[PDB]
Scaffold this motif. Structure first.
Motif, short mmCIF file in Angstrom:
data_model
loop_
_atom_site.label_atom_id
_atom_site.label_comp_id
_atom_site.label_asym_id
_atom_site.label_seq_id
_atom_site.Cartn_x
_atom_site.Cartn_y
_atom_site.Cartn_z
N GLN A 122 0.83 -1.20 0.00
CA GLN A 122 0.00 0.00 0.00
C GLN A 122 0.87 1.25 0.00
O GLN A 122 0.46 2.30 -0.50
CB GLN A 122 -0.90 0.01 1.23
N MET A 123 2.07 1.14 0.56
CA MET A 123 2.98 2.27 0.62
C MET A 123 3.51 2.62 -0.76
O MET A 123 3.50 3.78 -1.17
CB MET A 123 4.15 1.95 1.55
N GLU A 124 3.97 1.60 -1.49
CA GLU A 124 4.50 1.81 -2.83
C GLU A 124 3.58 2.74 -3.62
O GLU A 124 4.04 3.68 -4.26
CB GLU A 124 4.63 0.48 -3.56
N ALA A 125 2.28 2.48 -3.55
CA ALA A 125 1.30 3.29 -4.24
C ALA A 125 1.29 4.71 -3.67
O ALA A 125 1.47 5.68 -4.40
CB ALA A 125 -0.09 2.67 -4.10
N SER A 126 1.11 4.81 -2.36
CA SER A 126 1.10 6.11 -1.71
C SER A 126 2.40 6.84 -2.05
O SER A 126 2.43 8.07 -2.14
CB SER A 126 0.98 5.95 -0.20
N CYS A 127 3.46 6.06 -2.24
CA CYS A 127 4.76 6.63 -2.57
C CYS A 127 4.86 6.85 -4.08
O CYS A 127 5.48 7.81 -4.53
CB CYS A 127 5.87 5.68 -2.11
#
Length: 139
Positions: A122-127
């Motif tokens: 989920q972070m990769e996306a937010s990132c």
């Protein structure tokens, strides 16, 4: 002049660099991160996950969705049925993904020919999303 400047009690300069978030897609820990560098606004009535512009949108997908295949597409069709919106579709590889993710990715392209940029968490996306939004803002 010994006074102080206004505290933007109404900055009509939001149309600059802002991101929209579906009222529902608000109960997410991600939408929080965005509020760590970029501004985020909630809109009740939108389907997409994150709206960057009036022609660009971003939808989050995960292996769980791949399993379905039949049903989730309808939601994507409603987008292409619009006008000329070129958004980005994120995919979260889990297990049955990389395995059958290519089969779907193939049709999805010839079907929507949109943009698909997988991730991992989920972070990769937010990132991946923010990292992109921070680039657009710039001149």
């Amino acid at each position: 002049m010994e006074k102080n400047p206004p505290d933007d009690t109404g900055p009509v300069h939001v149309p600059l660099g802002h991101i929209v978030a579906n009222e529902k897609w608000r109960g997410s820990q991600l939408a929080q991160e965005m509020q760590g560098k970029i501004k985020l606004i909630f809109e009740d009535g939108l389907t997409p996950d994150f709206y960057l512009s009036n022609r660009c949108c971003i939808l989050y997908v995960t292996e769980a969705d791949l399993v379905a295949g039949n049903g989730y597409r309808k939601r994507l069709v409603r987008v292409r049925n619009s006008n000329n919106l070129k958004g980005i579709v994120v995919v979260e590889k889990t297990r049955m993904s990389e395995q059958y993710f290519p089969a779907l990715q193939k049709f999805t392209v010839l079907d929507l020919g949109m943009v698909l940029l997988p991730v991992a968490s989920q972070m990769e996306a937010s990132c991946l999303v923010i990292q992109l939004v921070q680039e657009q803002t710039k001149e």
